[PDB]
Design a binder for this molecule. Structure first.
Ligand SMILES: *[C@H](C)[C@H]1/C(=C/c2[nH]c(/C=C3N=C(/C=C4\NC(=O)C(CC)=C4C)C(C)=C\3CCC(=O)O)c(CCC(=O)O)c2C)NC(=O)[C@@H]1C
Ligand SMILES: CCC1=C(C)/C(=C/C2=NC(=C\c3[nH]c(/C=C4\NC(=O)[C@H](C)[C@H]4CC)c(C)c3CCC(=O)O)/C(CCC(=O)O)=C2C)NC1=O
Ligand SMILES: CCC1=C(C)/C(=C/C2=NC(=C\c3[nH]c(/C=C4\NC(=O)[C@H](C)[C@H]4CC)c(C)c3CCC(=O)O)/C(CCC(=O)O)=C2C)NC1=O
Ligand SMILES: CCC1=C(C)/C(=C/C2=NC(=C\c3[nH]c(/C=C4\NC(=O)[C@H](C)[C@H]4CC)c(C)c3CCC(=O)O)/C(CCC(=O)O)=C2C)NC1=O
Ligand SMILES: CCC1=C(C)/C(=C/C2=NC(=C\c3[nH]c(/C=C4\NC(=O)[C@H](C)[C@H]4CC)c(C)c3CCC(=O)O)/C(CCC(=O)O)=C2C)NC1=O
Ligand SMILES: CCC1=C(C)/C(=C/C2=NC(=C\c3[nH]c(/C=C4\NC(=O)[C@H](C)[C@H]4CC)c(C)c3CCC(=O)O)/C(CCC(=O)O)=C2C)NC1=O
Ligand SMILES: CCC1=C(C)/C(=C/C2=NC(=C\c3[nH]c(/C=C4\NC(=O)[C@H](C)[C@H]4CC)c(C)c3CCC(=O)O)/C(CCC(=O)O)=C2C)NC1=O
Ligand SMILES: CCC1=C(C)/C(=C/C2=NC(=C\c3[nH]c(/C=C4\NC(=O)[C@H](C)[C@H]4CC)c(C)c3CCC(=O)O)/C(CCC(=O)O)=C2C)NC1=O
Lengths: 161, 46, 65, 160, 160, 160, 161, 161, 160, 160, 161
């Protein structure tokens, strides 16, 4: 679990030097992004349920998954699906606030692949749902923070695939 | 030793520490927020 | 910081009448702070550890775990 | 930083970040320039701070520089000043982090155990960080001295 | 509040308040004047907020006011306006306290169980707080609307 | 079925099956023809049951078919009748199983969470299965109506 | 955990159809077997201890295992051996009653292989003991239910090997 | 557990009334004193062990209680005494920060008299130790911060006596 | 032995070995010659002990040698004497170990379960080890007979 | 003591005292005369032990008596010799009791916390007990010096 | 967990014989070593902290490990290092008392290799520290018991490497 600040401190710590001016440059880059990161995080926290319901209504609803024969058929599997999507959105918001995708590699993509292979979850439908959620949150909170959420959603998809 | 890794803990009815049974009974006989009192404060020395 | 541990633990003192495969063989995620005490407990059970693995760890990081 | 701590707080409470701590992260974001200035002035004058604080510590507590004490000899006094260098470095890290947690992770967990091993009196180290605090807050402006003295105060509190 | 949360979070950890938490309490103490101004803005114009938000809600969700709707028969609409007044009062409490522990600790814990026992759609209640947020942030300046919309945002988020 | 449930009961209690539950499985085996007849009559008249129950539900609770409600429009009403089709299908599965467990596995675990996601009022679904129960027990003979009404009663109990 | 009934309902559920006549055919097949399944289960439940003692007396007793040098030497290992055999017989009776070996794959053969590799248990002696127990229960309860127990004991051996 | 803000809100809520001018004035008083509370809490967190050891050096050292027969005699009893005094200083700091002594009678003064009476702990000697701790910290943080510390120290001594 | 048991006791209590149990290990070390003499005399006359004890057991309890009993026939009586051989062997192991723990590990954990499986009456085995105890203590000198009778007494106590 | 430890260790195990523990108590009961002789040797010459051990300690570790150390001044050196007298008294108690539960249960449990709260280097206290051990084992015969040095060894081991 | 006595009893037990004279020879060998084993164990228990501090001062202190860039840099890693060394010394003392390295293979070297690979601990520095500790304890307690500690420290190094 590291921020932009903690990754800068960590990188300056492995080689063993003090804080140089380029580290201060990265830190001021993080701060001037971090103000709008805060406002986008509040907007996503306000509208998370509508974001997830628009994501599943965009991609997963009238397919074979939410139909019978898919892995989203029963109400147990539907509730697990909505919970999986809520967790993707929440951890993407954490990675957006920290400015580092180390949390997504640490807590989300740790053993998610093998349990998704073992339960038979389709990776492609999940990736489509996450990308639909990505442009839903991009149209919600704005353009630059939409790109911020975009690279972290893409990090989740790349760790998933 | 008592519960293990897969078992939810449950109300034990212990014997051999002589304090342990009436303290356990006075603890589990109450409902939550029955009173503010601590059932044993400490054990008096011998 | 989470260790994937797999361990086969025989209980020699009691022949447990229930099935208890999870008490015997299990693979679980342990945090790093409690992994020392849990490894000591497993060694006091005497059970052999097939594999340990660490994937949340990021070793070598003095800051931010 | 403050963001990792707010994230682990929202994680253990299993909710999103409250707008109070979103406003806290935003205020931390705006106060980045002041903390950059504090860490800049501390990284500037680290040698003068260490020299005046080490001579003030040796003037206050002469048991460490006495024969039979811990820091006796050239190399032992140099290693004492090296440990003061590490602690001022962690002070600057915590000053720029906005939180005391990198100081905790790097240099506050087992200092009693390891100084119990080396034979270093830990209260003497607390006096050394006290002198470093007094000198660094003597250098800074009073508001920034209060900010740096908060982290210095935390270090001497975790010492003794 | 902020002070309660900082005291409890240092209290479980068996430590004093860290200096970062202390300047958090200090910044909240300084921003209390703007918090009280937002609270007077929300308190003095509660009639128009509740009236216009109920109007926009029943315009947006007419089925709850429609036959078979939970809020049917003047008193059902009117009764709902009392629940909206309760939530605006909790919004004012959360604005003053600087954190959402008044709002959560009074009117958000068993809100699902209560409104399921009453037969109420909770999404329509989220729309009621959404219209209250629209009227309230239409009533203030920019940063004041953001600071009040944080707590309105928390209420609508805690609904769903 | 009853056999899987008796097997997991004898497994958790780590013993063989008692002659009481062996007699229960034998009585279930002999009553297979009656439950086949009940599920046969239900699979026969599923469309008439669904049409009368849906019109009775829309007559009782008009909130869902109102503008702004959940089931508004042609496709939304058709999906409402599709969900009633799924629930009557699970009713027939549990009727032929002798147990409520396939109804639990397929359609009772997360219905509150998923209908919290879709916006469906769950008490309206409980009213829909109530009307399906009243119509199906109106069709059956009274003893078989009692058997099917046990499973219908279980579904509306797990709903509300 | 699925019966013949629950597997029929499950298969008709994945593809999404209602109950067809072939499903009713499988269900009546299950019932007409299930009456004698009940009587065989009562007979096995009555005589389980004699069945297990005849199984170990047939195969494991005068070999190197029950002798020194084997994995069945001490009384701890003997008690564990008798408990393992009792559990094989009990789960075979459950699979016979349900008409489906999903319980054997679910609770018996889940991690039994790797703990049998790790403790050094001989697989071949266990398989011989299970087959001896198989024809012991076949001579006890009869021919057709002997075949019923036979395919479930063979399922346990195939999951073991 | 409630600060001045939560107690004001609880009074206005038990009334059912809105926040009138007296509540606004009480909260303005707390929001004026809060910065002084913060700085005194930092200064007390600086010197926890020094204030505790100066309190023992003022009151309890070289008296009968550290001699044989005293309740502060052994090293276990000395360590537990230092632990108890650190508890009193820490919770007095918490009650100073909250501006309300509800945490003191919720979490210190709850069963403390009965615990000390069951153990044989002298209550007068520990009241004198808390009074010397108050005197030392009022010498540390100044006049008015020392007074607003001493009101909660006197609360602890009154509930203990 | 006594050393493994003292080590697992100091391990579970997470401390070093106390000088009391260091003195216990030292006294065990010095008494090694006496226990070597006891185990020497027992390994000398094991056949005579087994023959007299088996005939005394068959004279006392004739149910095991009767038709329909457990130990009926040549091979069954020989296996009975083989089990008495195993128990006297474990008696010698525990006599030379200074502790009852190898007797526990090898032959005391599941003897009730395995003799429930074979059909052996366990109280008859307790009588057999009683006769072996009486004969072996009849052979030894009285102090060494008390030592060996402690382990024999432990075995018949764990039997019944 | 030995009897307390044996009674407690049999007491948790829900058994009587094993005969090995009983001859342990018997051997301690016989060696009590030599224990009382070592105790009179340690008691009668406490003045020279404390004086010579303090002299050799302050010769070995002069920084704790130099200005800046803990035991600087008249009263502080008197309290230092008093703490050494306390530890020699606990050594005599542990010599009589046959075990270290008097020494540990009186003056070794929170010794680190106490001497950290006083500001004392614990290694210099270990050197004080080392010089006390040197003077005391220089005062006795061989086996008496070994038996007293066991408890002196336990005190210096429990320091670090 | 086996002694010399328990390993002798175990070996005589697998083949199935009683105690022979060669077993008594091994037992008397164990006893005549065990008296000085006790005195060396008391000496090591008395001076364990000085032994460990001399071991780290000999080998690990002025290298890159206790410096920055090494795995012994932070105080967390230093405290873990001192704890690892204390555990090596304590288990070597247990193996010296039992006369058998089965405890070192049972509790120390069970999964220590793979966690040392996974955390990135240097094996060579640990082996140097253990060997430095070996001749520190050899110079402390004497020559023959120094050899006793030597083969058990070498057993730990061979299981580590
Ligand atoms: C309002 C826009 C929506 C709505 C409201 C509605 N509420 C009720 C009845 C009650 N509501 C409460 C709610 C609270 N009590 C609290 O203390 C708090 C926190 C401060 C809340 C939110 C309670 C206790 C009642 C019961 C009566 C009472 O006030 O004591 C009703 C009536 C329900 C009924 O069956 O009569 C309605 C209609 N309903 C809507 O449709 C709107 C979406
Ligand atoms: C914090 C990081 C984290 C994640 C993400 C996580 C996921 C996770 N998803 C699971 C299941 C699931 N996840 C899905 C997912 C989906 N539905 C679909 O078909 C789509 C492809 C996708 C919806 C977008 C489904 C259907 C299941 C349940 C399948 C089953 O076990 O029946 C399970 C098994 C337990 C359960 O039933 O929930 C876990 C542990 N756990 C974690 O700790
Ligand atoms: C419900 C499904 C299920 C099974 C089957 C199961 C088996 C199981 N068998 C075990 C041991 C064992 N199983 C055997 C088996 C045998 N003796 C032999 O030599 C033969 C090859 C075979 C006798 C037929 C032995 C000897 C042990 C103990 C070995 C030891 O750990 O000392 C253990 C380790 C704990 C113990 O000592 O019992 C488990 C968990 N657990 C389960 O949950
Ligand atoms: C067998 C277990 C099971 C259940 C329960 C289930 C429910 C379910 N209900 C759905 C929709 C729906 N269900 C309703 C139903 C209702 N809203 C109303 O107004 C009525 C009162 C209520 C009817 C009783 C509506 C309106 C939709 C469409 C929601 C939307 O499109 O937003 C969908 C989405 C479409 C699809 O993928 O088929 C599913 C999966 N599926 C299952 O497999
Ligand atoms: C060291 C721990 C240990 C024990 C206890 C042990 C017991 C043991 N007893 C056996 C048989 C037996 N043991 C008995 C003994 C008795 N029945 C009687 O009538 C007598 C009263 C009683 C004698 C005291 C009999 C009759 C059999 C043969 C049972 C049979 O063949 O059905 C066998 C089967 C043959 C073999 O594999 O050697 C074992 C393993 N083995 C061990 O390794
Ligand atoms: C029987 C168990 C037991 C112990 C050990 C004990 C110690 C003890 N040592 C004290 C002081 C002290 N003890 C020392 C001792 C030393 N400083 C040094 O530099 C030397 C290394 C070392 C002695 C050789 C000093 C200097 C003080 C005074 C501390 C101060 O004044 O701040 C005090 C506080 C004043 C008092 O009431 O005596 C206690 C309670 N009390 C006990 O009941
Ligand atoms: C960032 C966290 C951190 C800390 C705290 C740290 C301490 C540290 N202090 C050391 C030595 C030392 N530190 C001291 C310091 C003192 N003794 C005195 O007399 C003075 C009062 C006190 C100075 C405040 C001395 C004398 C040594 C050498 C000890 C010896 O060589 O025996 C060493 C050994 C040399 C080395 O590997 O660099 C380390 C690792 N290292 C770290 O990475
Ligand atoms: C009873 C047997 C037993 C052992 C030995 C054991 C060791 C053990 N050593 C560990 C770490 C460690 N061990 C070391 C070791 C060293 N420092 C170095 O660099 C040198 C190469 C060596 C000092 C001699 C270090 C640095 C860590 C911590 C690395 C980290 O996780 O940050 C950990 C991870 C948890 C922790 O932080 O302590 C375990 C479990 N556990 C056991 O149950």
């Amino acid at each position: 679990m590291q921020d932009a600040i903690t990754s800068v401190i960590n990188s300056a710590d492995v080689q063993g030097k003090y804080l140089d001016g380029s580290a201060m440059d990265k830190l001021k880059a993080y701060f001037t992004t971090g103000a709008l990161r805060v406002r986008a995080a509040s907007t996503i926290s306000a509208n998370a349920a509508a974001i997830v319901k628009e994501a599943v209504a965009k991609s997963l609803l009238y397919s074979d998954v939410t139909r019978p024969g898919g892995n989203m058929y029963t109400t147990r599997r539907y509730a697990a699906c909505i919970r999986d999507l809520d967790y993707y959105l929440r951890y993407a918001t954490y990675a957006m606030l920290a400015g580092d995708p180390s949390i997504l590699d640490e807590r989300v993509l740790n053993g998610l692949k093998e349990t998704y292979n073992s339960l038979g979850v389709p990776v492609g439908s999940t990736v489509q749902a996450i990308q639909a959620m990505k442009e839903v949150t991009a149209g919600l909170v704005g353009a630059d923070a939409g790109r911020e959420m975009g690279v972290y959603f893409d990090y989740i998809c790349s760790g998933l695939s | 030793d008592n519960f293990g890794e897969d078992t939810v803990p449950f109300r034990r009815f212990p014997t051999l520490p002589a304090a342990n049974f009436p303290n356990t009974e006075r603890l589990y006989n109450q409902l939550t927020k029955q009173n503010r009192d601590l059932v044993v404060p400490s054990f008096e020395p011998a | 910081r989470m260790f994937k541990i797999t361990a086969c633990v025989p209980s020699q003192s009691r022949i447990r009448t229930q099935r208890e495969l999870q008490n015997t063989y299990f693979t679980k995620l342990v945090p790093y702070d409690n992994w020392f005490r849990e490894q000591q407990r497993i060694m006091k059970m005497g059970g052999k550890i097939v594999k340990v693995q660490l994937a949340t760890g990021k070793p070598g990081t003095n800051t931010g775990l | 930083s403050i963001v990792t701590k707010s994230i682990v707080n929202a994680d253990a409470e299993a909710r999103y970040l409250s707008p109070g701590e979103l406003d806290r992260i935003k205020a931390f974001v705006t106060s980045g320039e002041s903390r950059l200035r504090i860490a800049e002035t501390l990284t500037g004058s680290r040698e003068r701070i260490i020299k005046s604080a080490g001579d003030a510590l040796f003037q206050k507590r002469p048991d460490v520089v006495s024969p039979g004490g811990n820091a006796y000899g050239e190399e032992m006094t140099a290693t004492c000043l090296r440990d003061m260098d590490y602690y001022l470095r962690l002070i600057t890290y915590g000053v720029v982090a906005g939180d005391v947690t990198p100081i905790e992770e790097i240099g506050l967990v087992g200092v009693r155990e390891m100084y119990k091993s080396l034979g270093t009196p830990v209260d003497a180290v607390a006096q050394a960080v006290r002198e470093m605090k007094a000198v660094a807050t003597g250098m800074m402006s009073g508001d920034d001295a209060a900010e740096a003295g908060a982290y210095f105060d935390y270090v001497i509190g975790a010492m003794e």
